[PDB]
């Protein structure tokens, strides 16, 4: 089976603001990647091995709204640009890659999986360059190897006059390290 | 929800269609020059290519287009009309070998279907099953390029 994905909006602006302030979200959770939002920006969080990871430059040091109130971060690594909370009850976790593949696939917030060629521990080139506008909102999303295993989390794009030619990611390795710190 | 793959049928047979780049493509040996039904009447083919066993109508309602592959991978996946996925390794620009041969019946009715890459992008359109004594060991397919050039 090839990599396919679909997205579902679970809540709207106003319901999002209320939940943000209250910290109590009773909605049912499903999926490996959650579309996440703050009152200032929206991005993605990826559940890998029981932990819901995301990009520090999006979540900052905030708590995640849950059905039992706000949940404090499990890991915060300003340097690795990582933060992680216990994966919400109901989400499914990805498992780290163990095949050293150089053919990666990026999953965007619009549930599109675009191929990227690994060209370093943190960079991979888009086989088909796309407008930066396409990647907006996808930071924290996953980069899977052909087996559908976590290779890294999208962190920033390498834009050239508005077109994304490559991407910077946080390889799974930095996660284990962040957990050991 | 919207489907990329339409299960279609003519008085004589049943096969599949795949929407790619806004067109609903299928095999000429299934549809011929037939028009596709629509609640506002039959809509004629935009592209008919007998030479390539390729035809196409404007993508119907309840459909969503599939993305052409751009990773070159040779690890293809064929989707049957029963929604089954069959890992097919690429042996050439228009042919591939099933990683596990299945009786020809398993692939019966799936022509027009898509051959996806590891990213779920269209690599080609399933043209015909290559079977030896009733065992489909390989498949013939119309690569996306043909679709792309026909447009």
């Amino acid at each position: 089976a090839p990599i396919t994905a679909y997205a579902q909006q679970t809540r709207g602006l106003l319901g999002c603001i209320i939940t943000s302030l209250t910290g109590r979200d009773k909605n049912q959770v499903e999926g490996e990647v959650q579309i996440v939002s703050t009152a200032t920006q929206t991005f993605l969080a990826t559940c890998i091995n029981g932990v819901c990871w995301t990009v520090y430059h999006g979540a900052g040091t905030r708590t995640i709204a849950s059905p039992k109130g706000p949940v404090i971060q499990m890991y915060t690594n300003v340097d690795q640009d990582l933060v992680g909370w216990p994966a919400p009850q109901g989400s499914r976790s990805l498992t780290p890659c163990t095949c050293g593949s150089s053919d990666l696939y990026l999953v965007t917030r619009h549930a599109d999986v675009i191929p990227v060629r690994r060209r370093g521990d943190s960079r991979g080139s888009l086989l088909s360059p796309r407008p930066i506008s396409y990647l907006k909102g996808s930071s924290g999303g996953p980069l899977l190897c052909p087996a559908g295993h976590a290779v890294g989390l999208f962190r920033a794009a390498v834009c050239t006059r508005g077109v994304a030619k490559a991407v910077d990611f946080i390889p799974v390795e930095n996660l284990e390290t962040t957990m050991r710190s | 929800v919207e489907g990329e793959v339409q299960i279609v049928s003519t008085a004589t047979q049943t096969f599949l269609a795949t929407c790619i780049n806004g067109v609903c493509w299928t095999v000429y040996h299934g549809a011929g020059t037939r028009t596709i039904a629509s609640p506002k009447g039959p809509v004629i083919q935009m592209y008919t290519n007998v030479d390539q066993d390729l035809v196409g109508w404007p993508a119907p309602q309840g459909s969503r287009s599939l993305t052409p592959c751009t990773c070159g991978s040779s690890d293809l996946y064929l989707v049957t009309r029963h929604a089954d996925v069959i890992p097919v390794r690429r042996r050439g620009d228009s042919r591939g070998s099933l990683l596990s041969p299945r009786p020809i019946s398993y692939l019966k009715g799936s022509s027009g279907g898509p051959l996806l890459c590891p990213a779920g992008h269209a690599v080609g359109l399933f043209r015909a099953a290559v079977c030896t004594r009733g065992v489909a060991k390989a498949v013939d397919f119309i690569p996306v390029e043909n679709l792309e050039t026909t447009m």
Binding site: - | V5, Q6, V8, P42, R81
Partner: peptide
Amino acid sequence: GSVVIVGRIVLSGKPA
């Protein structure tokens, strides 16, 4: 006659 669509397949398995 025409080619009629008798069903549809969603590749992502989207329920919705």
